[PDB]
């Protein structure tokens, strides 16, 4: 698989799944924080 | 890149990988054991 | 820093005032005596719009307003907390913009370049100065301009246009949407003809100009060329712009009742009053 | 002053010239004329155009629909011309009512409208496939013809996608000019504010945009045009003097700055989406958003009413 | 009401518009690779050293060269990572990097500010034909001046302060745009000493029966030392640069010099 | 009448025709779908 | 204007076969759709 | 008539073909599926 | 193309259409089990 | 058979045929999702 | 088949296939948040 | 893992971070001011 | 301290420290004129 | 951490440092005026 | 390929490595300050 670094760039590729990772974590955080059960800062209750 | 810096590169990205997922499967266990996020039949 | 040919242009002179003083790069920006003015103007401005921002019951952004005196004030000064911040931030982007326009015509000079930027940078200029001067004062109140909100000046716009029963009927306004569309698309034909010459495609050389107007006599019969599409697209921006203006000093200082009625003096015309 | 270089004071002729195609079934019709005035602002040769194939197709279309709609108007103020005359901007030929589905309805109460709509759609697509064919023919790049398409993917919203969408044809669009305007402005009332439609905002951005972008463009390649910077691809493959001056004048204005070729990429870009994300926004209407000031409202950009 | 819900608060529409935000970020990084590719990378005001403030984006910020195919089947690379040379016949009036440059000689021969010009190609720009573009009408004789404007050839050449600098004697057409490009003026000053005068830096005036063409660039002293070229019927991209810089300079050096 | 053919180019012909022909048969395909009596799909009775 | 007369020929055997089997398809096609649902109706409507 | 390909070229006559019958298909299911009788998704009864 | 690349070309084109409708076909078929999509006389 | 290949280039042809069959087995999907009876998502009784 | 990498270069293919794929996933998981059904974070009775 | 310092430029990754980190916390800060419970400014009562 | 003086030119600081110190003056001014307590013109009492 | 000058020029990350000070400064002053308990200003009881 | 030696790598790694533990350390004395203060993970009933 250390074939893949040959075919892309090592800086490109880690600067490039950084960005992926942060946005993607981003929108998950945001979803949970839009949704009831799973809202941490205002915590309602699981009735 | 030279194989030898590409195998290089691999070693440590499989390390890292490895510890990110580690971590977030932590980070979901105990997000888990708070509150479980697959619903039974009659709802939460 | 600095691009790979950008030495050699940086030489002293060309201000209109200041002298040597002003006349230096801050990174990539030029300053001179109007970019200091332009900071001057923004900054004050700019922190009067978070002041008002302050004083309102919100900071969410889209919500945020700032809004001109009541009517009832007609063309005086208001009290700061009652609309005279509005007037204040108004004069100071009247400022700003004047200090713009003025800092592109010292890099006009210094490039050895014509002054059509900063010419026709000076119809938004007096598109804004329209709005929130001209027509205010011609229908005696500063609480005719619009607020500064990002929804709220959408919120004026719509006031304002049913207030004369429906404002497409408005005929230098049919006439400004007209220009605004054409400039839309003479702006998405120019942005392909350069890119499909530029980027002919894989195994194909650059074509050149004898391409680009066949194209369009090709396709339509016409070709305007390379230079007449510079200044075709750019008369139709700037005549987009006049005819806006047009339609608002029209509104409200000199037509006050139905655009929709206006109309009715086509049908009146004694070749077809039945 | 300086000469400004908005009109072209002498300006010469030569034998009219254009560059060559591969034989088709039409040759290049008409003969090239010269005008005066168009040599003024810009090139003075009316030149011949091409028919072909799908030009034929698209203009026999394109005839039946306009036809149609104007037969119809006529129609409308019962053949006569003065009632024509003193009513054009107020005649149009409306969509069917909602209980006729997507199914053909009754010629007077907007079958006809449906055969012209469906002739003009079809006339466009066509000419389309042209706009793309006149390119691969002179071994140009297909820019235009994607351009169009965003242009057309509104079209097809307001007058197709969306009744598809909506199971009905009665929100679509009336042939007539007071008509469609009116149809714009019950659109935004019935569906509560399009101002508060965030996609009809990006569009405005867009459009707004496209006429900040040819004004400073325009004013630019002008400003330089002492300098041959009219010249732009040739520019764009030997960077003159001219595309050097453009670039700084922006740096030094604003900080930043494009090349001669990227400036046109903007260009294509910003009059795209104008059209792109206006379409979205029409898709998005009374399918998922019944009321735009409602939705306003709850994300933020409104108080509670 | 349920319809556009995708969870308690999110909705397609909200959906959506992130999509349109993370797709149009993006494309303006697409558009800002498509900016770099001329003029960079950036360099230290001073020494020229590749030098400037970068983020993390530096890994995306500039393009592989594309390759341009020129039907004379040359070709040019864009990034070509070609830069200017460091040094300039000028000096600047304050050590510190952003200060301007004061010519050292005589800026408008020397070519520095607005008459410095780019090392473009010593080639002709081309017709579809290969036959160069810009050429004499004297060696186009298919082209004319349309038989309702003024003829430039003739004329007398005048400057802003009303000194005759020559006569018109040729203009230069380009083939390719069917447009006059410059005039070529014989100088009153050591007779039979031509110049090319860019068309677009003069107006014909005509509110007096010896109509004249006007020259606002640069005064008459100036004429002897506009840029001369090496053939008598075609000009380079070069030489058209720089005789182009010489003239745009007039308007903040011809006073001075 | 075969000299129509040195007079016109058979292939503009049959394009011109062939683009005609369609397009009016498609038109009075519409036409009759428009129409009670003869739309076929919809099948209303002869009352 | 068109292909030289062999190639026409070779041309000509593939189409005719690629088109006989499209209406083939077609028809048979055309004959369930009948059986289920016919597409003429009578005087009475369907 | 195998001379209609000694009239036209048979490569731009089958990327047209094939378009045209793709659409003329096209438009023959939807207006089948505009109808009662034949929308053969919702399946309405023929009221036997 | 020469004939002989063209020739290797539709035997794997050949190979890959039948696969993939030899999946559709399928796929076709289980969706039938659970709903057919001809309705009788009286619909559904 | 095979000469169609010689009349159109393979790759073309395959990414042509890609984006067609995509985009038409995703319309046929949204059009199951919009009828009751084969919305699988949803799951209507047939009553 | 290992042909087709001599038609399409590989790392264009694995760009384009990953956005595909991922804007493909990411599609279907909203879809399932709009079900009441599948919409496992509101979590609804079946 | 010093070795990620040969790829990228120590200057580049500590523009990028304190950039990347000052909008992060901007955003934490703002999303908590949104809130009840954590908005320290408004100070309500854990009801 | 005095080094900064070789960071930067005298002139250009005074003018811009200048400059900044009126605007800010200003902003101060406009924003004490906004409020009841502090606006000596208007005079509320206390 | 006097490095830190080899990598950053002191004269651009002055400029910087006091722009960005300033202008976090004016938004947390903004910030408190914005609020009942710490309007100076307005001076509300606790 | 950044261009710095291994030394300067080394060098440059210890400084940072030093940096982001200070960095983190007071990051996890401000939380658990704020945890203190109010906790963010709200039982069953809620707050
Ligand atoms: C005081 C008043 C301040 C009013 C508000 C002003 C806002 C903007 C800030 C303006 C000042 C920025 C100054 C700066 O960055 O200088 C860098 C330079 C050292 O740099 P360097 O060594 O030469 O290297 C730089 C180079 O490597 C960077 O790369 P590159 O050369 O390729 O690109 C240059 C950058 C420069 O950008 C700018 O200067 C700002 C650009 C304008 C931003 C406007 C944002 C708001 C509008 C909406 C945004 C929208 C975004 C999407 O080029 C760019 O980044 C261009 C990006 C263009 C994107 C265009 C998108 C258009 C979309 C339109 C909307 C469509 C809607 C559908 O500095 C120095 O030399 C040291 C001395 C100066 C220190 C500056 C300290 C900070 C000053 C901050 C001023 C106060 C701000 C509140
Ligand atoms: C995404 C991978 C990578 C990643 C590490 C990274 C991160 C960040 N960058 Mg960036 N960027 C990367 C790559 C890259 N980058 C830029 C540019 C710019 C300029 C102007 C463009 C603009 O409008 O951006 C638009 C958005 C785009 C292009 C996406 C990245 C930026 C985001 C998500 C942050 C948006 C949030 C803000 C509060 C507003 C920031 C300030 C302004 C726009 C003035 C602007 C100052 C800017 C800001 C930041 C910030 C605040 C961050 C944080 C939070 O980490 N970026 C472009 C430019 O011209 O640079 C001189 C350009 O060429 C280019 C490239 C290739
Ligand atoms: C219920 C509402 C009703 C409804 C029926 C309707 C509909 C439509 N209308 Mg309208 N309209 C209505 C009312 C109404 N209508 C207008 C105007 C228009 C113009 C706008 C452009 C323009 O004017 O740009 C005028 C340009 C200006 C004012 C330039 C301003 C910008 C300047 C100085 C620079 C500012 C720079 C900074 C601050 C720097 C910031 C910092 C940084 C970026 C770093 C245009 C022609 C136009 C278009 C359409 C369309 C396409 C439609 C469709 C599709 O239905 N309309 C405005 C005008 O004419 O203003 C002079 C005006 O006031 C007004 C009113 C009240
Ligand atoms: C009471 C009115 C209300 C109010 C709130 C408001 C106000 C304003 N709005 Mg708006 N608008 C309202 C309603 C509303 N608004 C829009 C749209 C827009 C976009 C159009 C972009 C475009 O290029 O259109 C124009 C392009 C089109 C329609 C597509 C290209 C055209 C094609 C392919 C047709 C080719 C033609 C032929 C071959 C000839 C055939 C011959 C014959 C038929 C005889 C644009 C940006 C825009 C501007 C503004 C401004 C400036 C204002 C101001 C200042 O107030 N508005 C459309 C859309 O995209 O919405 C998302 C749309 O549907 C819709 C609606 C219903
Ligand atoms: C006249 C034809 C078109 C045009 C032309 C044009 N605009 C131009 C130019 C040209 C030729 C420039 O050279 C100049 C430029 O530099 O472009 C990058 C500019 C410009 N056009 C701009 C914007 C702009 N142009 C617009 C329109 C148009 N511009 C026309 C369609 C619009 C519209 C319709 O909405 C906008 C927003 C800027 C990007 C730029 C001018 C930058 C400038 O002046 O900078 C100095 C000032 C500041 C940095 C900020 C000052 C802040 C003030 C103190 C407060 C302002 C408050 C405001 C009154 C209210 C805001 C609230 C809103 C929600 C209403
Ligand atoms: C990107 C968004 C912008 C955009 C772009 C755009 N528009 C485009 C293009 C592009 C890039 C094109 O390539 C295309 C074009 O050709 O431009 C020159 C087009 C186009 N944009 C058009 C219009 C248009 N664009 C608009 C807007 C926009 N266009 C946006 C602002 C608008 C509006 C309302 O804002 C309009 C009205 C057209 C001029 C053109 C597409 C022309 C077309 O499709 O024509 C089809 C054919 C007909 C209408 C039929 C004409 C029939 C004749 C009367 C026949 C007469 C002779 C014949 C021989 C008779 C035969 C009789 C027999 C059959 C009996
Ligand atoms: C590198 O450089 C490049 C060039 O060179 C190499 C170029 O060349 C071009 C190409 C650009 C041009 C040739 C000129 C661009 C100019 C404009 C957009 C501004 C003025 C508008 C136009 C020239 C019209 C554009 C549209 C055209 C030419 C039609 C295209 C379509 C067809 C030929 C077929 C279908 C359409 C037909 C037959 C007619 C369409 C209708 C009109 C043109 C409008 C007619 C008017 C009305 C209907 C009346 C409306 C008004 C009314 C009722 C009230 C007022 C009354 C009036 C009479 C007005 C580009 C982009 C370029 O990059
Ligand atoms: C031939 O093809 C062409 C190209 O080229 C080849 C081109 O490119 C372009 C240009 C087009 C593009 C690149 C396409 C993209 C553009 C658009 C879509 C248009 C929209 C534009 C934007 C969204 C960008 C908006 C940004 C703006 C307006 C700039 C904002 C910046 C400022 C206000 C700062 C200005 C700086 C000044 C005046 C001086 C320097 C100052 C600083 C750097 C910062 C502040 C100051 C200090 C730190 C210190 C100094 C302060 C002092 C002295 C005062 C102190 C006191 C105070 C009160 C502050 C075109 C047209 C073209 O045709
Ligand atoms: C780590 C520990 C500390 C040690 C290190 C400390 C010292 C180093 C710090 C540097 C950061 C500060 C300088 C930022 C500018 C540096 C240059 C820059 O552009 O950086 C980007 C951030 O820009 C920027 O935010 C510039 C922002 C300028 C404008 C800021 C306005 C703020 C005020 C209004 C806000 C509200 C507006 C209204 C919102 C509704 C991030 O990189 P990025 O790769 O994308 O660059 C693109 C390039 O790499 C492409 O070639
Ligand atoms: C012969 O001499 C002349 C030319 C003078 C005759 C006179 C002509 C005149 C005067 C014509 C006047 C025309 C006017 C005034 C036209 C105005 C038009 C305007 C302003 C239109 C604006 C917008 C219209 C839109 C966006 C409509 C779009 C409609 C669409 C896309 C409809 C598509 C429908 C389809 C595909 C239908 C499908 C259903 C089928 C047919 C399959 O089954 C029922
Ligand atoms: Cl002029
Ligand atoms: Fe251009």
């Not at chain 1, 799944?17 to 205002?42: C, P």
């Not at chain 4, 509560?192 to 900040?212: C, D, E, Q, T, V």
Request: hydrophobic residues 50%.
């Amino acid at each position: 698989m250390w074939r893949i670094w040959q075919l892309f760039d090592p800086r490109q590729a880690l600067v490039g799944l950084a960005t992926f990772l942060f946005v993607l974590a981003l929108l998950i955080h945001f979803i949970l924080l839009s949704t009831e059960r799973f809202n941490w800062l205002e915590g309602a209750s699981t009735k | 890149i030279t194989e030898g810096e590409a195998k290089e590169f691999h070693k440590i990205f499989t390390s890292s990988i490895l510890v990110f997922f580690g971590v977030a499967a932590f980070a979901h266990l105990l997000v888990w054991i708070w509150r479980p996020w697959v619903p039974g039949p009659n709802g939460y | 820093a600095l691009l790979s040919f950008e030495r050699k242009y940086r030489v002293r002179g060309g201000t209109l005032i200041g002298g040597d003083l002003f006349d230096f790069w801050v990174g990539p920006f030029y300053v001179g005596f109007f970019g200091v003015t332009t900071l001057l103007f923004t900054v004050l401005g700019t922190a009067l719009i978070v002041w008002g921002a302050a004083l309102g019951p919100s900071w969410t952004f889209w919500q945020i307003s700032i809004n001109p005196p009541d009517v009832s004030y007609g063309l005086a000064m208001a009290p700061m907390a009652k609309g005279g911040l509005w007037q204040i931030i108004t004069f100071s982007a009247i400022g700003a913009f004047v200090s713009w326009a003025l800092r592109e015509v010292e890099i006009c000079r210094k490039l050895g370049i014509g002054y059509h930027i900063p010419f026709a940078f000076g119809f938004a200029i007096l598109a804004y100065v329209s709005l929130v001067v001209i027509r205010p004062v011609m229908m005696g109140a500063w609480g005719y301009g619009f607020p500064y909100g990002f929804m709220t000046h959408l919120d004026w716009v719509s006031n304002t246009g049913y207030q004369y029963a429906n404002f497409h009927y408005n005929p230098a306004h049919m006439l400004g949407i007209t220009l605004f569309f054409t400039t839309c698309l003479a702006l998405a034909l120019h942005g392909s003809l350069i890119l499909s010459a530029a980027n002919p495609g894989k195994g194909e050389v650059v074509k050149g100009p004898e391409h680009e107007n066949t194209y369009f006599q090709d396709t339509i019969g016409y070709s305007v060329g390379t230079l007449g599409i510079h200044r075709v697209g750019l008369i139709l921006a700037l005549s987009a712009v006049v005819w806006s203006i047009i339609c608002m000093i029209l509104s409200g200082p000199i037509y006050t009742g139905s655009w929709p009625d206006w109309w009715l003096w086509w049908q009146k015309l004694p070749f077809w009053n039945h | 002053s300086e000469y400004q270089n908005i009109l072209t004071g002498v300006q010469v002729r030569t034998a009219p010239h254009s560059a060559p195609i591969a034989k088709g079934i039409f040759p290049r019709l008409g003969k090239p004329g010269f005008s005066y005035w168009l040599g003024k602002i810009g090139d003075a040769q009316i030149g011949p155009i091409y028919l072909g194939t799908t030009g034929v197709l698209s203009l026999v279309f394109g005839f039946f629909a306009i036809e149609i709609i104007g037969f119809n108007l006529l129609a409308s103020v019962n053949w006569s011309p003065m009632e024509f005359g003193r009513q054009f901007f107020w005649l149009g030929l409306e969509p069917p009512a909602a209980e006729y589905g997507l199914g053909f309805a009754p010629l007077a109460e907007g079958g006809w409208w449906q055969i012209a709509g469906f002739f003009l759609t079809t006339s466009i697509l066509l000419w389309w496939v042209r706009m793309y064919r006149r390119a691969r023919a002179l071994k140009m790049g297909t820019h235009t013809a994607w351009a169009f398409a965003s242009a057309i993917f509104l079209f097809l919203s307001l007058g197709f996608i969306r009744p598809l969408l909506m199971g009905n044809f009665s929100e679509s669009v009336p042939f007539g000019i007071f008509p469609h305007l009116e149809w714009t402005n019950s659109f935004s009332l019935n569906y509560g504010n399009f101002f508060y439609n965030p996609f009809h905002m990006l569009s405005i951005a867009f459009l707004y945009g496209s006429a900040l972008l040819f004004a400073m463009h325009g004013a630019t390649i002008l400003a330089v045009s002492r300098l041959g910077g009219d010249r732009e691809v040739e520019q764009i493959t030997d960077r003159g003097t001219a595309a050097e001056r453009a670039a700084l004048f922006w740096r030094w204005t604003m900080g930043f700055n494009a090349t001669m070729e990227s400036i046109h990429r903007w260009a294509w870009w910003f009059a795209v989406l104008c059209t792109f994300t206006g379409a979205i926004g029409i898709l998005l209407t009374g399918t998922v958003v019944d009321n735009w000031f409602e939705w306003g409202v709850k994300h933020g950009l409104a108080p509670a009413p | 009401m349920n319809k556009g819900d995708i969870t308690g608060y999110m909705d397609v529409a909200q959906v959506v518009l992130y999509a349109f935000w993370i797709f149009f970020a993006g494309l303006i990084i697409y558009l800002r690779r498509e900016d770099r590719r001329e003029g960079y990378p950036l360099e230290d005001a001073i020494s020229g050293k590749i030098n400037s403030l970068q983020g993390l984006g530096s890994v995306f910020s500039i393009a592989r060269p594309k390759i341009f195919k020129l039907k004379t089947g040359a070709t040019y690379a864009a990034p070509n990572f070609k830069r200017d040379a460091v040094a300039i016949k000028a000096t600047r009036t304050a050590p510190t990097a952003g200060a301007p440059f004061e010519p050292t000689g005589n800026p408008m021969t020397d070519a520095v500010g607005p008459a410095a010009y780019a090392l473009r190609d010593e080639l002709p720009d081309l017709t579809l034909g290969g036959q160069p573009a810009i050429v004499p009408l004297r060696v186009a004789p298919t082209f004319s001046v349309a038989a309702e404007d003024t003829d430039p050839r003739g004329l007398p050449v005048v400057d802003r302060k009303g000194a005759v600098a020559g006569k018109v004697t040729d203009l230069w057409i380009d083939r390719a745009s069917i447009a006059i490009r410059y005039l070529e003026v014989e100088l009153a000053a050591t007779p039979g000493r031509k110049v090319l005068l860019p068309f677009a830096a003069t107006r014909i005036n005509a509110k007096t029966k010896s109509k004249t063409v006007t020259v606002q660039s640069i005064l008459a002293r100036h004429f002897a030392n506009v840029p001369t070229i090496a053939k008598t019927d075609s000009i380079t991209r070069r030489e058209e640069d720089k005789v182009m810089a010489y003239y745009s300079s007039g308007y903040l050096y011809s006073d001075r010099v």
